[PDB]
CSV table of C-alpha atoms and ligand atoms in Angstrom, one decimal:
chain,number,residue,atom,x,y,z
A,252,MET,CA,-59.3,19.7,-31.8
A,253,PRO,CA,-56.8,16.8,-32.2
A,254,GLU,CA,-53.3,17.5,-31.0
A,255,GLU,CA,-49.9,16.4,-32.3
A,256,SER,CA,-48.3,13.7,-30.1
A,257,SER,CA,-45.2,14.4,-28.0
A,258,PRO,CA,-42.0,14.8,-30.1
A,259,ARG,CA,-40.3,11.5,-31.0
A,260,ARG,CA,-37.1,11.0,-28.9
A,261,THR,CA,-33.9,9.1,-29.1
A,262,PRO,CA,-33.4,6.2,-26.5
A,263,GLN,CA,-31.4,8.9,-24.5
A,264,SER,CA,-34.6,11.1,-24.5
A,265,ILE,CA,-33.4,13.8,-27.0
A,266,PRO,CA,-36.1,14.9,-29.5
A,267,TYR,CA,-35.2,13.8,-33.1
A,268,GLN,CA,-36.4,17.3,-34.2
A,269,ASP,CA,-33.2,18.6,-32.5
A,270,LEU,CA,-30.8,16.3,-34.3
A,271,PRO,CA,-29.9,15.3,-37.9
A,272,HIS,CA,-32.0,12.2,-38.7
A,273,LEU,CA,-33.5,10.0,-41.3
A,274,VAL,CA,-36.7,7.8,-41.1
A,275,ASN,CA,-36.0,4.3,-42.4
A,276,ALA,CA,-38.5,2.0,-44.4
A,277,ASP,CA,-39.7,0.5,-41.1
A,278,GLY,CA,-40.6,4.0,-39.7
A,279,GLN,CA,-37.7,4.0,-37.4
A,280,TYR,CA,-35.6,7.1,-36.8
A,281,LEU,CA,-31.9,6.9,-37.4
A,282,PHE,CA,-29.6,9.4,-35.9
A,283,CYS,CA,-27.3,11.0,-38.6
A,284,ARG,CA,-23.9,12.7,-38.6
A,285,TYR,CA,-22.2,14.8,-41.3
A,286,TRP,CA,-18.8,16.3,-41.8
A,287,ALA,CA,-18.8,18.5,-44.9
A,288,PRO,CA,-15.8,20.5,-46.3
A,289,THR,CA,-16.1,24.3,-46.9
A,290,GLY,CA,-15.8,23.9,-50.7
A,291,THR,CA,-17.6,21.7,-53.2
A,292,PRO,CA,-16.9,18.0,-52.2
A,293,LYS,CA,-14.7,15.8,-54.4
A,294,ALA,CA,-16.7,12.8,-53.3
A,295,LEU,CA,-19.0,11.3,-50.7
A,296,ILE,CA,-18.1,8.7,-48.1
A,297,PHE,CA,-20.4,6.7,-45.8
A,298,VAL,CA,-19.0,5.5,-42.5
A,299,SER,CA,-20.5,2.2,-41.2
A,300,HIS,CA,-19.9,1.4,-37.5
A,301,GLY,CA,-19.8,-2.0,-35.9
A,302,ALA,CA,-21.8,-4.1,-33.4
A,303,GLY,CA,-22.7,-2.4,-30.1
A,304,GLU,CA,-21.0,0.9,-30.9
A,305,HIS,CA,-22.0,4.0,-32.8
A,306,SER,CA,-21.0,6.7,-35.3
A,307,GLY,CA,-19.6,9.1,-32.8
A,308,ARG,CA,-16.5,6.8,-32.5
A,309,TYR,CA,-15.5,7.8,-36.0
A,310,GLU,CA,-15.0,11.5,-35.3
A,311,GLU,CA,-11.2,11.6,-36.0
A,312,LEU,CA,-11.3,9.4,-39.1
A,313,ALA,CA,-14.2,11.6,-40.4
A,314,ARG,CA,-12.4,14.8,-39.8
A,315,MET,CA,-9.3,13.5,-41.6
A,316,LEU,CA,-11.6,12.5,-44.6
A,317,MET,CA,-13.3,15.9,-44.6
A,318,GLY,CA,-9.8,17.4,-44.7
A,319,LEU,CA,-9.4,15.6,-48.1
A,320,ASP,CA,-12.5,17.5,-49.3
A,321,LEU,CA,-14.8,14.5,-49.0
A,322,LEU,CA,-18.2,15.0,-47.5
A,323,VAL,CA,-18.4,12.3,-44.8
A,324,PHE,CA,-21.8,11.0,-43.6
A,325,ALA,CA,-23.0,8.3,-41.2
A,326,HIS,CA,-25.9,7.1,-39.2
A,327,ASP,CA,-26.2,4.9,-36.1
A,328,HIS,CA,-27.5,1.5,-37.3
A,329,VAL,CA,-31.0,0.4,-36.0
A,330,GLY,CA,-30.7,-0.8,-32.4
A,331,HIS,CA,-27.5,1.3,-31.9
A,332,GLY,CA,-26.4,4.6,-30.4
A,333,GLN,CA,-28.9,7.4,-30.8
A,334,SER,CA,-31.1,5.5,-33.3
A,335,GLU,CA,-34.4,3.8,-32.5
A,336,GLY,CA,-34.9,0.1,-32.0
A,337,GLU,CA,-34.4,-2.5,-29.2
A,338,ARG,CA,-30.6,-2.6,-28.5
A,339,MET,CA,-28.8,-5.1,-30.7
A,340,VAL,CA,-31.8,-6.6,-32.3
A,341,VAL,CA,-32.4,-6.6,-36.1
A,342,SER,CA,-35.3,-8.4,-37.9
A,343,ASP,CA,-32.9,-9.4,-40.6
A,344,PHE,CA,-29.2,-8.3,-41.2
A,345,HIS,CA,-30.3,-6.8,-44.6
A,346,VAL,CA,-32.1,-4.0,-42.7
A,347,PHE,CA,-28.6,-2.5,-42.1
A,348,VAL,CA,-27.8,-2.7,-45.8
A,349,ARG,CA,-31.2,-1.3,-46.9
A,350,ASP,CA,-30.7,1.6,-44.5
A,351,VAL,CA,-27.2,2.5,-45.7
A,352,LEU,CA,-28.6,2.4,-49.3
A,353,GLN,CA,-31.4,4.8,-48.3
A,354,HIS,CA,-29.0,7.2,-46.8
A,355,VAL,CA,-26.5,7.0,-49.8
A,356,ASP,CA,-29.5,7.5,-52.2
A,357,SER,CA,-30.7,10.5,-50.2
A,358,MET,CA,-27.2,12.1,-50.2
A,359,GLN,CA,-26.7,11.4,-53.9
A,360,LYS,CA,-29.9,13.4,-54.6
A,361,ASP,CA,-28.4,16.4,-52.9
A,362,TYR,CA,-24.9,15.8,-54.6
A,363,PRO,CA,-25.5,14.3,-58.0
A,364,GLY,CA,-22.6,13.0,-60.1
A,365,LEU,CA,-20.3,12.8,-57.1
A,366,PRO,CA,-18.4,9.4,-56.6
A,367,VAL,CA,-19.5,7.6,-53.4
A,368,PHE,CA,-17.1,5.5,-51.2
A,369,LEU,CA,-17.8,3.3,-48.2
A,370,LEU,CA,-15.8,2.9,-45.0
A,371,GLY,CA,-16.7,0.1,-42.7
A,372,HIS,CA,-15.2,-1.5,-39.5
A,373,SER,CA,-16.0,-5.0,-38.1
A,374,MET,CA,-19.8,-5.7,-38.5
A,375,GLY,CA,-19.9,-2.3,-40.3
A,376,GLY,CA,-17.4,-3.8,-42.8
A,377,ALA,CA,-19.7,-6.8,-43.5
A,378,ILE,CA,-22.5,-4.2,-44.1
A,379,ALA,CA,-20.2,-2.3,-46.5
A,380,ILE,CA,-19.3,-5.5,-48.4
A,381,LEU,CA,-23.0,-6.5,-48.7
A,382,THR,CA,-23.9,-2.9,-49.8
A,383,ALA,CA,-21.3,-2.8,-52.6
A,384,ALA,CA,-22.2,-6.4,-53.7
A,385,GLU,CA,-25.9,-5.4,-54.0
A,386,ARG,CA,-25.0,-2.4,-56.3
A,387,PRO,CA,-22.0,-3.5,-58.5
A,388,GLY,CA,-20.4,-0.5,-60.3
A,389,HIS,CA,-22.1,2.0,-58.1
A,390,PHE,CA,-19.4,2.7,-55.4
A,391,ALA,CA,-16.0,4.2,-56.2
A,392,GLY,CA,-14.2,2.4,-53.5
A,393,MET,CA,-14.5,0.7,-50.1
A,394,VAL,CA,-12.2,1.0,-47.0
A,395,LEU,CA,-12.4,-2.0,-44.7
A,396,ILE,CA,-11.0,-2.0,-41.2
A,397,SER,CA,-11.0,-5.6,-39.8
A,398,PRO,CA,-14.3,-6.4,-41.5
A,399,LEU,CA,-16.4,-9.3,-40.3
A,400,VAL,CA,-15.7,-11.9,-43.0
A,401,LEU,CA,-14.8,-14.9,-40.9
A,402,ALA,CA,-15.7,-15.0,-37.2
A,403,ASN,CA,-13.1,-16.3,-34.6
A,404,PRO,CA,-13.5,-20.1,-35.0
A,405,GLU,CA,-14.4,-20.6,-31.3
A,406,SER,CA,-17.1,-17.9,-31.5
A,407,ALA,CA,-18.5,-19.4,-34.7
A,408,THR,CA,-19.0,-22.8,-32.9
A,409,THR,CA,-20.6,-21.1,-29.8
A,410,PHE,CA,-23.2,-19.3,-31.9
A,411,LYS,CA,-23.9,-22.2,-34.3
A,412,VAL,CA,-24.8,-24.3,-31.2
A,413,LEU,CA,-26.9,-21.4,-29.6
A,414,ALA,CA,-28.7,-20.8,-33.0
A,415,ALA,CA,-29.6,-24.6,-33.4
A,416,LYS,CA,-31.1,-24.6,-29.8
A,417,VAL,CA,-33.5,-21.6,-30.4
A,418,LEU,CA,-34.3,-23.0,-33.9
A,419,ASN,CA,-35.9,-25.9,-32.1
A,420,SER,CA,-37.2,-24.2,-28.8
A,421,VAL,CA,-38.5,-20.8,-27.6
A,422,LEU,CA,-35.9,-18.9,-25.5
A,423,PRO,CA,-36.2,-15.1,-25.9
A,424,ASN,CA,-33.7,-14.2,-23.2
A,425,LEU,CA,-30.9,-16.5,-24.4
A,426,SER,CA,-27.6,-14.7,-24.8
A,427,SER,CA,-23.9,-15.3,-25.0
A,428,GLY,CA,-21.4,-13.5,-22.8
A,429,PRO,CA,-20.3,-9.9,-23.5
A,430,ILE,CA,-17.5,-9.1,-26.0
A,431,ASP,CA,-14.1,-9.2,-23.9
A,432,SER,CA,-13.0,-5.5,-24.0
A,433,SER,CA,-9.3,-6.5,-23.5
A,434,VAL,CA,-9.1,-8.0,-27.0
A,435,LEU,CA,-10.2,-4.8,-28.6
A,436,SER,CA,-6.9,-2.9,-28.7
A,437,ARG,CA,-3.5,-3.0,-27.1
A,438,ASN,CA,-4.1,0.7,-26.4
A,439,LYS,CA,-5.5,0.4,-22.8
A,440,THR,CA,-6.8,4.0,-22.9
A,441,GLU,CA,-9.0,3.0,-25.8
A,442,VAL,CA,-10.2,-0.1,-24.0
A,443,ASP,CA,-11.1,2.2,-21.0
A,444,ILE,CA,-12.9,4.7,-23.3
A,445,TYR,CA,-15.0,1.8,-24.8
A,446,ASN,CA,-15.9,0.7,-21.3
A,447,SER,CA,-17.0,4.3,-20.3
A,448,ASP,CA,-19.1,5.3,-23.3
A,449,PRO,CA,-22.8,5.2,-22.3
A,450,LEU,CA,-23.8,4.9,-26.0
A,451,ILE,CA,-22.0,1.5,-26.3
A,452,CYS,CA,-24.0,-1.6,-25.6
A,453,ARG,CA,-21.7,-4.0,-23.6
A,454,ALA,CA,-24.4,-6.5,-22.8
A,455,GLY,CA,-24.1,-10.2,-23.9
A,456,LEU,CA,-25.0,-10.9,-27.5
A,457,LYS,CA,-28.6,-12.1,-27.8
A,458,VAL,CA,-29.0,-15.4,-29.8
A,459,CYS,CA,-31.3,-13.7,-32.4
A,460,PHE,CA,-28.6,-11.1,-33.1
A,461,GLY,CA,-25.9,-13.9,-33.2
A,462,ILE,CA,-28.1,-15.6,-35.8
A,463,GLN,CA,-28.1,-12.4,-37.9
A,464,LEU,CA,-24.3,-12.3,-37.6
A,465,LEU,CA,-24.1,-15.9,-38.8
A,466,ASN,CA,-26.4,-14.7,-41.7
A,467,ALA,CA,-24.0,-11.8,-42.3
A,468,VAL,CA,-20.9,-14.2,-42.5
A,469,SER,CA,-22.8,-16.6,-44.9
A,470,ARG,CA,-24.0,-13.7,-47.1
A,471,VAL,CA,-20.5,-12.1,-47.2
A,472,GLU,CA,-19.0,-15.5,-48.4
A,473,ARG,CA,-21.6,-15.7,-51.2
A,474,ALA,CA,-21.0,-12.0,-52.1
A,475,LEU,CA,-17.2,-12.2,-52.5
A,476,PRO,CA,-17.2,-13.4,-56.2
A,477,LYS,CA,-19.7,-10.6,-57.0
A,478,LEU,CA,-17.4,-7.9,-55.4
A,479,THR,CA,-15.7,-5.8,-58.1
A,480,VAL,CA,-15.5,-2.5,-56.1
A,481,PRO,CA,-12.0,-1.1,-55.5
A,482,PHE,CA,-11.0,-1.7,-51.8
A,483,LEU,CA,-8.3,-1.2,-49.2
A,484,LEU,CA,-8.4,-3.9,-46.5
A,485,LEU,CA,-6.6,-3.3,-43.1
A,486,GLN,CA,-6.3,-6.2,-40.7
A,487,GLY,CA,-4.4,-6.9,-37.4
A,488,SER,CA,-2.7,-10.3,-37.2
A,489,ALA,CA,-3.8,-10.9,-33.5
A,490,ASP,CA,-7.5,-10.1,-34.0
A,491,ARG,CA,-9.6,-12.3,-31.8
A,492,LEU,CA,-12.9,-10.9,-33.1
A,493,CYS,CA,-12.6,-10.9,-36.9
A,494,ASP,CA,-10.2,-13.7,-37.8
A,495,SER,CA,-7.3,-12.6,-40.0
A,496,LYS,CA,-8.1,-15.7,-42.2
A,497,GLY,CA,-11.2,-13.7,-43.4
A,498,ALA,CA,-9.1,-10.8,-44.7
A,499,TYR,CA,-7.0,-13.3,-46.7
A,500,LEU,CA,-10.2,-15.0,-48.0
A,501,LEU,CA,-11.6,-11.6,-49.1
A,502,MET,CA,-8.3,-10.8,-51.0
A,503,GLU,CA,-8.5,-14.2,-52.7
A,504,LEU,CA,-12.2,-14.5,-53.6
A,505,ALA,CA,-13.1,-10.9,-54.5
A,506,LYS,CA,-13.1,-10.2,-58.2
A,507,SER,CA,-12.0,-6.5,-57.7
A,508,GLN,CA,-9.2,-5.4,-60.0
A,509,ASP,CA,-8.1,-2.9,-57.4
A,510,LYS,CA,-7.5,-4.7,-54.0
A,511,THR,CA,-4.9,-4.0,-51.4
A,512,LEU,CA,-4.2,-5.7,-48.0
A,513,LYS,CA,-2.2,-4.3,-45.2
A,514,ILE,CA,-1.5,-6.5,-42.2
A,515,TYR,CA,-0.5,-4.9,-38.8
A,516,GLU,CA,1.7,-7.5,-37.1
A,517,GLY,CA,0.5,-8.1,-33.5
A,518,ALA,CA,-2.3,-5.6,-33.7
A,519,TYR,CA,-5.7,-6.4,-32.2
A,520,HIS,CA,-9.2,-5.6,-33.6
A,521,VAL,CA,-9.9,-1.9,-33.5
A,522,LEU,CA,-7.1,-0.7,-35.7
A,523,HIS,CA,-8.1,3.0,-35.8
A,524,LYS,CA,-7.9,3.0,-32.0
A,525,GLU,CA,-4.8,0.9,-31.5
A,526,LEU,CA,-1.3,1.7,-30.4
A,527,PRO,CA,-0.3,5.2,-31.9
A,528,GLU,CA,2.2,3.5,-34.3
A,529,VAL,CA,-0.7,1.5,-35.8
A,530,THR,CA,-3.4,4.1,-35.6
A,531,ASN,CA,-1.1,6.8,-37.3
A,532,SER,CA,-0.4,4.3,-40.1
A,533,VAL,CA,-4.1,3.4,-40.5
A,534,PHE,CA,-5.0,7.1,-40.9
A,535,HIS,CA,-2.1,7.7,-43.3
A,536,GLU,CA,-2.9,4.6,-45.4
A,537,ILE,CA,-6.6,5.5,-45.7
A,538,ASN,CA,-5.6,9.1,-46.5
A,539,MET,CA,-3.2,8.0,-49.3
A,540,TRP,CA,-5.7,5.4,-50.7
A,541,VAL,CA,-8.7,7.8,-50.9
A,542,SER,CA,-6.5,10.8,-52.1
A,543,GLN,CA,-5.2,8.6,-55.0
A,544,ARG,CA,-8.8,7.6,-56.0
A,545,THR,CA,-10.4,11.2,-55.7
A,546,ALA,CA,-7.6,13.2,-57.4
B,45,LIG,O1,-14.8,0.1,-31.9
B,45,LIG,C1,-15.3,-1.0,-31.8
B,45,LIG,C2,-16.1,-1.3,-30.5
B,45,LIG,O2,-16.7,-2.5,-30.5
B,45,LIG,C3,-15.9,-3.5,-31.1
B,45,LIG,C4,-16.5,-4.9,-30.7
B,45,LIG,C5,-17.8,-5.2,-31.6
B,45,LIG,N1,-17.5,-4.9,-33.0
B,45,LIG,C6,-18.1,-5.7,-34.0
B,45,LIG,O3,-18.7,-5.2,-35.0
B,45,LIG,N2,-18.1,-7.1,-33.9
B,45,LIG,C7,-16.8,-7.7,-33.4
B,45,LIG,C8,-17.2,-9.0,-32.6
B,45,LIG,C9,-18.0,-9.9,-33.5
B,45,LIG,C10,-18.4,-11.1,-32.6
B,45,LIG,C11,-19.1,-12.2,-33.4
B,45,LIG,C12,-20.1,-12.9,-32.8
B,45,LIG,C13,-20.8,-13.9,-33.5
B,45,LIG,C14,-20.4,-14.2,-34.8
B,45,LIG,C15,-21.1,-15.3,-35.6
B,45,LIG,F1,-22.4,-15.5,-35.1
B,45,LIG,F2,-21.2,-15.1,-36.9
B,45,LIG,F3,-20.5,-16.5,-35.4
B,45,LIG,C16,-19.4,-13.5,-35.5
B,45,LIG,C17,-18.8,-12.5,-34.8
B,45,LIG,C18,-19.2,-9.2,-34.1
B,45,LIG,C19,-18.8,-7.9,-34.8
B,45,LIG,C20,-17.1,-3.5,-33.3
B,45,LIG,C21,-15.8,-3.3,-32.6
B,45,LIG,N3,-15.3,-1.9,-32.8
B,46,NA,NA1,-42.4,4.8,-45.2
B,47,NA,NA1,-23.2,17.4,-57.3
């Protein structure tokens, strides 16, 4: 008698049968998270995390959104958190977009006729932009927290050189240095939390992944005149990871009739984990923006 193989487990050895999950088009398990209100939801909202991190870092934002009667859902992108895949490796950046769309399509089957929003931060924001651009008119709105539109100019040069080296030669171990945690937030407790979370990948960025980020930046630039979705854009003026010039470029080139930019003077990259004065405003602004577009 043939027997069923050992239960499939997360990279942290937890069986997927014990967790909310989804199997993507490549047969990879994605870890899922849901925050549903007690009553019938007013809308759905997918939360898209950034590079090296995971969906668990959006707990407080998700609970605020659930408090507005939205059903919030997320998954860890391939190669991240509790999902399968080699850490910070992606065959093509579009895999992230394809997987967000599969999850959105699955949820819309269970909640037909409900409006669907996107919330994305950093690389997660580039994923949200490419997702909305692929399906014009499908999403009700997008909330972008320091999205990856334009890389810091120095980092763009570093990866363009590194990409051109492996274009010509075979170097599978080639990597840049790790992301400098001190530039994440002026809130040192949040810097310390980022450095303590075992689900966060704090290794150097592999060149193959850097190439996919270069692809993401190029694709976002081409997508901007196709963007019509309503959006709220939040950006720190002292962001060393996603250049503030990108937020101004997105406001200028997107065709969206409903677009708003809020700049946080002196703030670093992770606005929803910044100094309390910034974080409290970020939460309030998202709450007002979503409340106005779900009422
Ligand atoms: O809460 C957090 C924890 O981690 C923080 C750092 C990484 N982060 C992100 O998603 N990140 C921020 C850092 C950024 C670095 C980067 C590297 C190459 C390129 C290229 F190749 F195009 F030139 C562009 C940009 C990549 C995207 C999430 C953020 N948010
Ligand atoms: Na399949
Ligand atoms: Na429904």
